[PDB]
Design a protein around this ligand. Structure first.
Ligand SMILES: CCCCCCCCCCCCCCC[C@@H](O)O[C@H](CO[C@H](O)CCCCCCCC[C@@H](C)CCCCCCCC)COP(=O)(O)O[C@H]1[C@H](O[C@@H]2O[C@@H](CO)[C@H](O)[C@H](O)[C@@H]2O)[C@H](O)[C@H](O)[C@@H](O)[C@@H]1O[C@H]1O[C@@H](CO[C@@H](O)CCCCCCCCCCCCCCC)[C@@H](O)[C@H](O)[C@@H]1O
Length: 195
């Protein structure tokens, strides 16, 4: 029918996101973003304490490698060859995955700096009704969650927020122009993450 007002949905999702401890995430890079060699990633993240497990497809020296990865006790491990775990040192020297759910600099900060929010339509995400919402994310909030963006201006964005229930952030995408973008889909909020 009619669409709810986006502004209160965004505010509710902001609050809900700040309280998150854990989630499943699927990250897709569309086109090309300089200094971001990642193509796709799917995994499970928990925080306080930080742990993550999953799989990643990335480009290394011009070859796409499929790898499994684990972040535990501050350290990043990954199978660059199958069943062979390599230790790549402190995760934070590459990207501390806890950043995504940091209430100050993660997804909640993106939501809190999401300007001009406007409800655009309704979409199913992972079996759930969500409201698709356009807006622009501040350069600072974008650079904090995704440094390679190197934004010097507000970044056009789309968020999908659950229409009912908890109003979680279901999906978000940041458009760098020219068919290049990064999108994350969140689900399984509060799941246990063993690792
Ligand atoms: C959703 C679930 C939660 C997760 C969220 C998603 C996060 C995904 C992150 C994926 C990025 C993996 C790509 C690794 C590329 C690799 O080249 O990184 C650089 C080189 O590192 C070495 O080369 C490592 C060995 C080579 C290959 C890597 C091994 C394989 C491991 C991995 C790829 C497999 C699994 C990966 C998946 C893990 C997911 C984790 C959960 C970093 O080197 P340094 O450690 O020296 O770091 C930098 C240094 O900074 C450090 O910080 C200092 C602070 O003071 C310290 O003192 C420290 O000493 C050091 O100085 C330097 O300054 C230097 O200037 C800079 O150039 C250095 O490297 C930089 O060099 C380039 C490399 O670029 C490409 O190679 C790719 C870089 C990708 C990094 C971007 C992170 C992803 C963005 C997150 C998106 C989130 C989306 C949110 C939703 C919208 C830059 O792009 C980038 O800035 C990079 O960091």
């Amino acid at each position: 029918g009619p669409l709810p007002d986006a502004k209160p949905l965004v505010e509710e999702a902001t609050a809900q996101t700040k309280a998150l401890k854990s989630a499943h995430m699927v990250l897709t890079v569309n086109g090309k973003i300089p200094g971001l060699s990642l193509k796709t990633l799917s995994g499970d993240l928990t925080t306080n304490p930080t742990a993550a497990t999953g799989n990643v497809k990335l480009t290394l020296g011009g070859s796409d490698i499929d790898a499994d990865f684990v972040v535990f006790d501050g350290i990043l491990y990954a199978t660059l060859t199958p069943n062979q775990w390599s230790d790549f040192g402190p995760a934070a020297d590459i990207y501390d995955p806890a950043q995504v759910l940091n209430p100050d600099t993660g997804l909640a900060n993106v939501l809190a700096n999401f300007a001009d929010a406007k409800a655009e339509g309704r979409d199913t995400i992972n079996g759930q009704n969500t409201i698709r919402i356009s807006g622009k994310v501040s350069a600072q909030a974008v650079n904090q969650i995704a440094p390679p963006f190197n934004a010097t201006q507000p970044v056009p964005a789309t968020v999908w927020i659950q229409e009912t229930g908890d109003h979680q952030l279901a999906q978000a995408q940041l458009d760098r122009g020219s068919g290049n973008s990064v999108q994350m889909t969140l689900s399984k909020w509060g799941e246990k993450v063993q690792v």
